[PDB]
């Protein structure tokens, strides 16, 4: 029941109606999630195979899956065991359940991020503004220990410490890992995570507009063609006198 | 001629080909077939979703996800079904408004079962929105089902009997999916009785005057206009599907249902917001529920409120203005319904709520009596 | 149902019609079309517009009040 | 009189009340309405099962268990639905046999869509038996779906396209449940077209002679006989439900599906055993499948094989004997179908298999030509 | 459909009928009923029974062979 | 592909069409399952609450559930833990999965017993005959170590050692725990486990027969009543001459 400040609209390169995602920024954004976010945030609905042909090759994505160990089994003795990930595995969860998560994060629950952009008003505008929007509390607000001031979060008191900062990681293509850079890349990746169909739907949308621009006047012309018999008909009344 | 004597093609002939129709019915008469198309789309997209959806709380949220990510072209099927439902309600509300403005309600049998067709679609889309099992799905399902607890004496029994428990849970999601599957076929059956009673008389037209002196065959004139209209219906749907799929959907529904805390502000889909406003306009439980029921069942008693010696409003300016004050008033109640119960939205919601019932029950009946006396009859 | 040949009675009315392949489907589409649209909107605007302007004024006032009703006062 | 002029009660009147019917139709004409009742029972028991059943391999077996143990009176609903399906096939086979013995197939339109009504019920009960996901459900589903792999060139593509994978798995169980839900409504629609074409002519009767000289109204005479028949239909069902529910069901279906090993001997439900026998009677893949299709599609070309100048077999002793040799032969093929492919059941299955097609295609057509010459015309 | 009064032509045929409250619904149910059932079965038994006896003989032979075909022989 | 010997039909007191189960024998049969069978055989579909009002009181069945420990959780720290059973718990599984079961039973899998009577031809006749039917192998059959001869089992070689024998347990009501007694009681319980609706369906079946014995002749009488107008009608043909 506090005052709200809504995020402005940043000019993402995928904002326009026909504008695709930038897949190099996705690639960088996955690197942010893996190294920084995945230790607190799950992504229960994304698997390594989804990366293939979007931002990594099959060989690259396979090598990426094998960099972590996942549980499998039972074997012939009835025991569970660990093996390296394969393309079919979903991204490892950091905690077995949310109760462990609250205990590891001063009682707060980092939500799953698979859909985070779609489950909050403002999408990447909100997330970009949140990550890059931390500041000292205004005069008269004193937050309990464990909590951090962030003016874009409802109530302005969030249980997540600022998770990104200059040089948290180095990008593979040499791009300077500035806070704003890291925010932009991770936000583009999170859009893709929530809406992998983004680019394909816009390509279809273009084809739908072009076909409609053809079919609407042609079907209109067929309507007018048949109806012209009636629209130009003339009547006369000739009663006997 | 076999088109006129084969017992099967006879019924098709007398309904789509050689059926006499007025020569002057405008685009507002296109929405009857667009409702049929909308229904067909919701059958087909609905059916192909039901081949990949699972009906239990643990994986109901995940099976919808599984469609939008893993099955070929299931995300487009799913948004067609979601936005198809909203297009269904656009067409429903134009269909009814056409009937009121031009006086088509005097077809009592056709009209009175049309009301039934409205209720069953609402009951369908209600039990459809529960199935993805998001937050809005769960608590929207909670607010609605508890409306029956307001009935005296037997209230709680009907709710817990509907629930199959003590709250909306696994047992409800399963039966609601069963109901959501079967109701759209009942709808199609009643829509066929809708037409049967309609063909008993034929269509009204913009003037309210009998068109027997000047009829044209339905084919080719209205077959092509219904095609053109449908092509504009596909346009409306595909713009929503392919350029704005989450414009009408609420973000909160993208978080799995949590039976322990609500969102700070819940809002139905747009096509129910006007009625939710009427419910909240009363600080009484049973009062709010009855005002909600009569908000829709008011349609059943429109024909009893017709006072004009003319049928259509085309020649009734004073009724036209009161008609558009009702659309604006309904557009007002939609706005309140999407806003939190706080000042001044509360008092606005009550004034617009009275104006709704005041127009239908008082101002429009007497407005027709005036203009009869202005015309000396 | 109802059939052609059993509808009503008409006498002394002549109808002239032209084939659709002999005439134009878009004749004077803008020449005569736009002036007719102006006449049609002119004839009905006073019956439709006022209630929706009335809605517009309530809509801006109600949000303007609510958007600032939760602001703080010095007291 | 409103019963004759209300557009809705008019169609009821001309079908159940004032419909002229022959005065001499025997109990073999009761099975038309018992099929309708059977359908209604399978809708209702089916619907109330779908409110507690879940459609995924992990808990599909367990959700049926959950019905028979935990939900109030779900075990009786479930056995009604299981045994109701078997009663459906009893009535189907009497219905057809009535049509053949008394020559009702000369109603081509009614008959030829009756064949369609047979196929769709088989397709329904097939996709119903898969849903509990027992052993017989899984491997019976495997044998059937692989019949399409016999089609040259496009075989494997249609199977894997039906499967949604490389074998019957989670994706099949979900769509099969969707198909099993929607098909019984399509059936009801076609059953309505069944009656529409029927009423074009009225019923045949035991003699094969026109009954126009002596008709009685359907009500009260055949309304009460259809009630009495239905009460004997409930008796048959309830004896199976309440005293022998697992008599027709196979025990193997009470073990969850295992995609890794089969049972040593698999047998369909009784109502498909005659056709399974025909399939196994041929040591060829595509040959067995085609012999299976023609086993049922033989009905479509019965009307082309009518040679008698008389319609019913009531006055044709030589056709009567060949008719009952077909019932015994079909009863033989049912026995083989329930037995393992081993000596001498193999060779018996082939002789009874030829006798089936030999009777319909040769012996019965020529038997009618003889008795025409014995009667000098 | 078809209606009463448009079916066919009949002449010179008289029908006498009694009310159902004036007569008995089970008249001579066993006196005349059983002899009629005997006549009806007698008239059709030779056309129905043989093929089902033929089935019975094949059924017992086939099982009798199979039930012992998997017995062992000394060789 | 071996020779088969099918079980004879024993005169169970629930064999008749209207004959209920003997609930004292059920009670004894549960005691056999708990003490002897439950260490190798699961019953995944029976819970302690199902016993209430059939063969134990609510207090008795509650005390029975608390005699075992079951897993529950998570707690507020995210850890799983053990507590005593309650009425709502299903009977504990002896193994977490079938792979452990084969390893603990020389490679064979003891099936779940919830439905065992219904998933094998002959039901309790088969099970009764199997348990009580062990004997020395005939001349010329030599079974590999680990397997046991039982002529009712398909193939005559079963991986289950004879599980019951004189005095495996003592019954609460003093009944002599003879092999045949133990077999009879456990078989009655297993019928109940597979078909708890047994008694109720027969009570309904009796009511269904009685109502039909009334309604069938009455509805028959209504048919004959209406039809009598036609069945006794007389015709005469009087053509002009
Ligand atoms: C949700 C879906 C809802 C479906 C609604 C169903 C609509 C329907 O079925 O009927 C269409 C119904 C058919 O109109 P019509 O057959 O021409 O007859 C109109 C009357 O005769 C009236 O005669 P008129 O002479 O007064 O007609 C005026 C003329 C419009 O007059 C104009 O020229 C205005 C255009 C100004 C552009 C200035 C550029 C210079 O035609 C129209 O009113 C149609 C406007 C569409 C303009 C599209 C651009 C071309 O009206 C339409 O909306 C047509 C839209 C079709 C799209 C064409 C795109 C190319
Ligand atoms: C799966 C469900 C299948 C449903 C089948 C649909 C059956 C149906 O709708 O029509 C019933 C159809 C009606 O027969 P109906 O109205 O009497 O007319 C027969 C003809 O008029 C023939 O005239 P009739 O004089 O030759 O009739 C002979 C008389 C039978 O003649 C006898 O008296 C034989 C009984 C021997 C007992 C000896 C004791 C002394 O009636 C019957 O044939 C019916 C037999 C039922 C006997 C039940 C015991 C009473 O035939 C039946 O099967 C009646 C069974 C009704 C149960 C009554 C239980 C009390
Ligand atoms: C219960 C559901 C509530 C849900 C809330 C929905 C939000 C409402 C948003 C408002 C959208 C309005 C659509 C645009 C309407 C423009 C109409 C116009 O341009 O022309 C007025 C026309 C006059 O034309 P005449 O027929 O008199 O004669 C013509 C002579 N050339 O007269 C006509 O054409 C009028 C025909 C009827 C119009 C249908 C719109 C009404 C929609 C809701 C009605 C529900 C009432 C219960
Ligand atoms: C394709 C499916 C295969 C599935 C296999 C099913 C297993 C078969 C088990 C056999 C059960 C047989 C039912 C009992 C029939 C007894 C008939 C009898 O008692 O009377 C013969 C009767 C003669 O009477 P009329 O009509 O000539 O004149 C009467 C004058 N008082 O004549 C009539 O009443 C005959 C009317 C028709 C009888 C219907 C039975 C046929 C069932 C399968 C036919 C499928 C063919 C494709
Ligand atoms: C990659 C750098 C990260 C992004 C992007 C986000 N985080 Fe976190 N996070 C953490 C906790 C304990 C919470 C719960 C806070 C609360 O409920 O009060 C969160 C929550 C979020 C949210 C939700 C915001 C909202 O609900 O409106 C977002 C959008 C989010 N986080 C983005 C903890 C951690 C953490 C542990 C050290 C790390 C490394 C990250 N978060 C990383 C990211
Ligand atoms: C209570 C005394 C018991 C009853 C009743 C049954 N058993 Fe057992 N069981 C065990 C194994 C290792 C198997 C698998 C054998 C194989 O697959 O070859 C079984 C199997 C059964 C079966 C299935 C018979 C069939 O499939 O036809 C039945 C009906 C059965 N058992 C009854 C092992 C054990 C065991 C471990 C020491 C005990 C205590 C029991 N079984 C107890 C019972
Ligand atoms: C699934 C729901 C519905 C379907 C498929 C449907 C379909 C149709 C169709 C095809 C027509 C004739 C063509 C036309 O006028 O557009 C029609 C006419 C009509 N409908 Fe509906 N309708 C539905 C719901 C309703 C509702 C909700 C109402 C009113 C509350 C209603 C009342 C009427 C009336 C009065 C007419 C006659 C209009 C005239 O001929 O002037 N119907 N409907
Ligand atoms: C007039 C007819 C129908 C309407 C208005 C309608 C409407 C809806 C709506 C609004 C939703 C919510 C979608 C979402 O929030 O994601 C939904 C979901 C669903 N509908 Fe329907 N529906 C109709 C018919 C059908 C039919 C006939 C079927 C199946 C045979 C079906 C199957 C489903 C399924 C499986 C879902 C859940 C998947 C999902 O949420 O997308 N629907 N429906
Ligand atoms: C769901 C499936 C079906 C339903 C509900 C149904 C229902 C009916 C009904 C009510 C009648 C009129 C009353 C009677 O004669 O009993 C009838 C007649 C008839 N049916 Fe069906 N039937 C079905 C399937 C079939 C099949 C599988 C066939 C043939 C292969 C068939 C062929 C016929 C014929 C030829 C008649 C005319 C009989 C006569 O009037 O003598 N029908 N059906
Ligand atoms: C002519 C119509 C129908 C026939 C012949 C039929 C037949 C069957 C059969 C043979 C089974 C297997 C039962 C078992 O093995 O346990 C089954 C299962 C099932 N049926 Fe149907 N059915 C029909 C209509 C319906 C309808 C309309 C619905 C739902 C709206 C439905 C829902 C189900 C469900 C949920 C199951 C799985 C539960 C179970 O196995 O008992 N059925 N059906
Ligand atoms: C079951 S959640 C739901 N179902 C809808 C689609 C619906 C409700 C009533 C009638 C038709 C359709 C809707 O708007 N909501 N949301 C919602 C939110 C708050 C309160 C009530 C419903
Ligand atoms: C899908 S398992 C199945 N479905 C049935 C009910 C069916 C099959 C075909 C047509 C209608 C109904 C049937 O008998 N089986 N069993 C079975 C066993 C072995 C081989 C084939 C089927
Ligand atoms: Cl979702
Ligand atoms: Cl089961």
XYZ file of N, CA and C in Angstrom, chain A residues 52-168:
351
model
N 20.371 -24.581 -28.687
C 20.978 -25.017 -29.939
C 20.343 -24.259 -31.100
N 21.181 -23.659 -31.946
C 20.712 -22.893 -33.091
C 20.101 -21.537 -32.825
N 20.132 -21.053 -31.590
C 19.730 -19.683 -31.257
C 20.961 -18.837 -30.931
N 21.775 -19.280 -29.970
C 22.985 -18.554 -29.587
C 24.217 -19.435 -29.388
N 24.104 -20.768 -29.442
C 25.256 -21.662 -29.382
C 25.059 -22.770 -30.408
N 26.168 -23.331 -30.893
C 26.090 -24.540 -31.702
C 25.721 -25.744 -30.834
N 25.356 -26.842 -31.504
C 25.097 -28.093 -30.797
C 26.316 -28.555 -30.007
N 27.498 -28.518 -30.629
C 28.719 -28.887 -29.917
C 29.001 -27.962 -28.739
N 28.840 -26.653 -28.932
C 28.997 -25.708 -27.831
C 28.012 -25.981 -26.698
N 26.731 -26.177 -27.032
C 25.720 -26.414 -26.004
C 25.908 -27.751 -25.300
N 26.401 -28.762 -26.013
C 26.733 -30.034 -25.382
C 27.862 -29.858 -24.376
N 28.953 -29.211 -24.797
C 30.051 -28.913 -23.881
C 29.568 -28.126 -22.663
N 28.637 -27.193 -22.866
C 28.066 -26.441 -21.749
C 27.286 -27.330 -20.780
N 26.474 -28.260 -21.293
C 25.732 -29.157 -20.406
C 26.639 -30.039 -19.551
N 27.783 -30.463 -20.079
C 28.681 -31.374 -19.370
C 29.519 -30.668 -18.305
N 29.425 -29.341 -18.205
C 30.168 -28.573 -17.218
C 29.555 -28.651 -15.824
N 28.381 -29.265 -15.689
C 27.680 -29.424 -14.423
C 27.390 -30.911 -14.261
N 27.151 -31.328 -13.020
C 26.795 -32.709 -12.721
C 25.337 -32.749 -12.280
N 24.599 -33.737 -12.794
C 23.186 -33.930 -12.492
C 22.924 -35.364 -12.056
N 21.822 -35.536 -11.327
C 21.443 -36.835 -10.795
C 20.729 -37.655 -11.862
N 20.980 -38.962 -11.852
C 20.321 -39.887 -12.759
C 20.157 -41.212 -12.025
N 19.455 -42.155 -12.659
C 19.234 -43.464 -12.079
C 17.763 -43.807 -11.975
N 17.436 -44.939 -11.324
C 18.313 -45.903 -10.637
C 19.190 -46.725 -11.588
N 20.337 -47.220 -11.110
C 21.098 -48.236 -11.826
C 20.557 -49.626 -11.470
N 21.303 -50.682 -11.820
C 20.808 -52.036 -11.595
C 20.811 -52.434 -10.124
N 21.463 -51.657 -9.255
C 21.502 -51.936 -7.826
C 20.467 -51.132 -7.048
N 19.702 -50.275 -7.723
C 18.710 -49.441 -7.079
C 19.220 -48.155 -6.466
N 20.446 -47.738 -6.772
C 21.027 -46.536 -6.187
C 20.951 -45.370 -7.166
N 20.704 -44.167 -6.644
C 20.872 -42.963 -7.448
C 22.342 -42.556 -7.482
N 22.717 -41.841 -8.541
C 24.096 -41.428 -8.761
C 24.135 -40.164 -9.619
N 25.335 -39.599 -9.769
C 25.559 -38.358 -10.505
C 26.319 -38.621 -11.811
N 25.934 -37.937 -12.887
C 26.668 -37.943 -14.148
C 26.640 -36.528 -14.708
N 27.517 -36.216 -15.668
C 27.434 -34.912 -16.342
C 26.138 -34.710 -17.116
N 25.727 -33.445 -17.184
C 24.534 -33.081 -17.924
C 24.644 -33.398 -19.405
N 23.483 -33.622 -20.023
C 23.342 -33.691 -21.471
C 22.304 -32.677 -21.934
N 22.191 -32.560 -23.261
C 21.343 -31.544 -23.877
C 19.901 -31.620 -23.387
N 19.427 -32.812 -23.024
C 18.040 -33.008 -22.616
C 17.752 -32.594 -21.178
N 18.773 -32.318 -20.374
C 18.564 -31.909 -18.991
C 18.122 -30.457 -18.879
N 17.191 -30.209 -17.961
C 16.843 -28.842 -17.616
C 17.958 -28.235 -16.764
N 18.027 -26.911 -16.772
C 19.028 -26.214 -15.980
C 18.937 -26.619 -14.507
N 20.063 -26.965 -13.857
C 20.014 -27.401 -12.454
C 19.322 -26.391 -11.554
N 18.479 -26.904 -10.692
C 17.878 -26.063 -9.668
C 18.919 -25.785 -8.576
N 19.005 -24.554 -8.055
C 19.956 -24.316 -6.952
C 19.529 -24.893 -5.612
N 18.229 -25.056 -5.371
C 17.730 -25.631 -4.133
C 16.731 -26.740 -4.432
N 16.659 -27.774 -3.584
C 15.661 -28.832 -3.829
C 14.223 -28.359 -3.714
N 13.954 -27.345 -2.895
C 12.596 -26.867 -2.670
C 12.665 -25.436 -2.137
N 11.547 -24.699 -2.154
C 11.587 -23.301 -1.677
C 11.903 -23.127 -0.194
N 11.619 -24.113 0.657
C 11.910 -23.949 2.080
C 13.410 -23.830 2.324
N 14.211 -24.636 1.630
C 15.659 -24.483 1.711
C 16.080 -23.120 1.174
N 15.397 -22.639 0.133
C 15.739 -21.356 -0.477
C 15.545 -20.198 0.499
N 14.401 -20.144 1.196
C 14.224 -19.087 2.192
C 15.310 -19.148 3.253
N 15.675 -20.353 3.691
C 16.680 -20.457 4.739
C 18.043 -19.965 4.260
N 18.355 -20.151 2.975
C 19.622 -19.698 2.412
C 19.621 -18.233 1.984
N 18.472 -17.555 1.991
C 18.361 -16.173 1.516
C 17.611 -15.303 2.522
N 17.984 -15.424 3.796
C 17.387 -14.652 4.892
C 15.855 -14.645 4.857
N 15.259 -15.768 4.460
C 13.818 -15.911 4.509
C 13.075 -15.571 3.231
N 13.740 -14.965 2.254
C 13.134 -14.599 0.982
C 13.331 -15.692 -0.062
N 12.418 -15.730 -1.040
C 12.409 -16.777 -2.059
C 12.772 -16.186 -3.410
N 13.952 -16.453 -3.968
C 14.205 -16.004 -5.326
C 13.282 -16.763 -6.266
N 12.420 -16.089 -7.027
C 11.506 -16.840 -7.891
C 12.245 -17.474 -9.056
N 11.623 -18.510 -9.611
C 12.046 -19.028 -10.901
C 12.020 -17.903 -11.928
N 13.015 -17.889 -12.816
C 13.161 -16.820 -13.796
C 12.707 -17.194 -15.202
N 12.197 -18.412 -15.415
C 11.822 -18.827 -16.766
C 10.844 -17.839 -17.394
N 9.950 -17.263 -16.584
C 8.839 -16.437 -17.054
C 8.832 -15.054 -16.407
N 9.950 -14.638 -15.799
C 9.931 -13.474 -14.914
C 9.497 -12.223 -15.667
N 9.894 -12.107 -16.936
C 9.567 -10.915 -17.709
C 8.064 -10.837 -17.962
N 7.385 -11.980 -18.042
C 5.959 -11.989 -18.333
C 5.091 -11.951 -17.081
N 5.646 -12.247 -15.899
C 4.843 -12.289 -14.680
C 4.862 -10.981 -13.889
N 5.509 -9.941 -14.411
C 5.593 -8.618 -13.799
C 5.346 -7.560 -14.862
N 4.467 -6.615 -14.533
C 4.202 -5.459 -15.379
C 5.484 -4.696 -15.681
N 5.697 -4.403 -16.969
C 6.872 -3.691 -17.422
C 7.991 -4.567 -17.953
N 7.909 -5.882 -17.775
C 8.866 -6.793 -18.389
C 10.323 -6.407 -18.174
N 11.123 -6.435 -19.247
C 12.531 -6.051 -19.127
C 12.719 -4.594 -18.715
N 11.767 -3.712 -19.034
C 11.852 -2.352 -18.511
C 11.861 -2.361 -16.989
N 11.024 -3.196 -16.374
C 11.026 -3.290 -14.919
C 12.333 -3.899 -14.420
N 12.747 -5.026 -15.005
C 13.938 -5.718 -14.518
C 15.178 -4.856 -14.727
N 15.295 -4.215 -15.896
C 16.455 -3.369 -16.155
C 16.510 -2.236 -15.142
N 15.361 -1.615 -14.880
C 15.300 -0.485 -13.966
C 15.572 -0.927 -12.533
N 15.131 -2.135 -12.170
C 15.338 -2.656 -10.822
C 16.817 -2.913 -10.557
N 17.480 -3.642 -11.461
C 18.866 -4.041 -11.226
C 19.772 -2.823 -11.139
N 19.502 -1.814 -11.962
C 20.365 -0.655 -12.122
C 19.877 0.528 -11.298
N 18.878 0.318 -10.441
C 18.168 1.393 -9.786
C 18.366 1.438 -8.291
N 19.312 0.673 -7.746
C 19.552 0.684 -6.312
C 20.112 2.039 -5.901
N 19.763 2.470 -4.696
C 20.283 3.729 -4.189
C 20.103 3.774 -2.679
N 20.716 4.785 -2.061
C 20.634 4.913 -0.618
C 19.185 5.224 -0.228
N 18.728 4.772 0.939
C 17.357 5.093 1.361
C 17.139 6.591 1.526
N 15.953 7.105 1.182
C 15.649 8.512 1.477
C 15.642 8.773 2.977
N 15.778 10.044 3.330
C 15.613 10.462 4.716
C 14.307 9.953 5.331
N 14.422 9.376 6.532
C 13.319 8.830 7.308
C 12.913 7.382 7.095
N 13.448 6.682 6.098
C 13.179 5.255 5.903
C 14.366 4.476 6.456
N 14.103 3.589 7.414
C 15.139 2.761 8.027
C 14.724 1.300 7.912
N 15.400 0.587 7.015
C 15.100 -0.804 6.711
C 15.754 -1.730 7.724
N 15.033 -2.786 8.093
C 15.593 -3.771 9.006
C 16.794 -4.441 8.350
N 17.738 -4.887 9.180
C 18.869 -5.653 8.674
C 18.373 -6.834 7.845
N 19.129 -7.179 6.802
C 18.747 -8.229 5.882
C 18.070 -7.751 4.611
N 17.478 -6.557 4.629
C 16.722 -6.016 3.509
C 17.461 -4.838 2.883
N 17.197 -4.610 1.596
C 17.901 -3.616 0.793
C 16.903 -2.699 0.097
N 17.202 -1.401 0.113
C 16.356 -0.408 -0.539
C 16.451 -0.472 -2.060
N 15.289 -0.550 -2.716
C 15.240 -0.476 -4.169
C 13.916 0.172 -4.586
N 13.929 1.393 -5.138
C 12.671 2.152 -5.286
C 11.674 1.557 -6.278
N 12.111 0.689 -7.191
C 11.213 0.030 -8.134
C 10.530 -1.210 -7.577
N 10.991 -1.741 -6.466
C 10.364 -2.919 -5.891
C 9.144 -2.496 -5.065
N 8.020 -3.217 -5.143
C 6.844 -2.795 -4.366
C 7.192 -2.770 -2.885
N 6.906 -1.641 -2.243
C 7.250 -1.450 -0.853
C 8.635 -0.867 -0.659
N 9.444 -0.819 -1.721
C 10.808 -0.297 -1.744
C 11.798 -1.076 -0.876
N 11.399 -2.208 -0.288
C 12.298 -3.027 0.525
C 12.359 -4.449 -0.021
N 13.514 -4.819 -0.578
C 13.695 -6.081 -1.289
C 14.735 -6.908 -0.546
N 14.522 -8.218 -0.501
C 15.413 -9.122 0.192
C 16.589 -9.597 -0.631
N 16.775 -9.057 -1.836
C 17.907 -9.390 -2.693
C 18.948 -8.280 -2.660
N 20.166 -8.624 -2.238
C 21.274 -7.688 -2.322
C 21.560 -7.411 -3.797
N 22.068 -6.224 -4.140
C 22.395 -5.944 -5.550
C 23.243 -7.058 -6.142
N 22.766 -7.751 -7.182
C 23.471 -8.960 -7.622
C 24.494 -8.709 -8.711
N 24.465 -7.540 -9.350
C 25.364 -7.236 -10.452
C 26.069 -5.916 -10.195
N 27.247 -5.791 -10.790
C 28.135 -4.656 -10.593
C 29.223 -4.768 -11.650
N 29.976 -3.691 -11.805
C 31.073 -3.679 -12.761
C 32.001 -4.879 -12.562
N 32.363 -5.529 -13.671
C 33.280 -6.679 -13.686
C 32.809 -7.924 -12.917
N 31.504 -8.191 -12.773
C 31.149 -9.461 -12.128
C 31.599 -10.633 -12.991
